[PDB]
Design a protein around this ligand. Sequence first.
Ligand code: SF4
Lengths: 170, 47
Amino acid sequence: MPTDFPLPSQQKPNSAVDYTLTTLDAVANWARQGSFWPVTFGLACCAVEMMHVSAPRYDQDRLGIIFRASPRQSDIMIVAGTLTNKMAPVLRQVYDQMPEPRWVISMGSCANGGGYYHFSYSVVRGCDRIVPVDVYVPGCPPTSEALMYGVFQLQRKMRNTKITRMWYRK
Amino acid sequence: EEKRRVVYEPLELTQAFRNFSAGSTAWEPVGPGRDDRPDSFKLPTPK
Ligand code: SF4
């Protein structure tokens, strides 16, 4: 085995096999990027803004986002609003019955590190302590522009998923 | 992770809570204030 090998963040296609694998990866990531099914988790002041994305100013259907509010059909989950002590096992359970190519995004400032209720008694100090969240959407009314930007950030991460290229174990 | 469930462990903060009511004047700086008691229903003075 070579003592030097390029990092998977730094590698380029050089074999014709790699061109085939990269284009196939692009098709898989591309269908994953376009079709995009979150689940309606939203519960509080951070849920009306989720509906504001469904509003006819900042449409999500033109992005392909649609709320199949059924976690078995969901790709990802948008933790939105505050997160209490009393709810949190239900949050874990809703995370459990999701299919494997999943993500979860922390819309809202209460949803990461407690936010405005960081010192309350019956509150989870951000949804880090329950589910592994990959993108945070900051903003206490986390802006529709910002929420969509969080989705585009996540979609850039989706473009760098490399599900096919890792069969060659790069 | 290992119990595959959430557990209830006693409190640990990243940042200790800081109130700031330690800076406070003892006497309430509002004055005594006038009354609005009706002249019927306060006590008549003697004589
Ligand atoms: S992000 Fe803001 S509006 Fe939403 S739960 Fe936190 S404090 Fe409430």
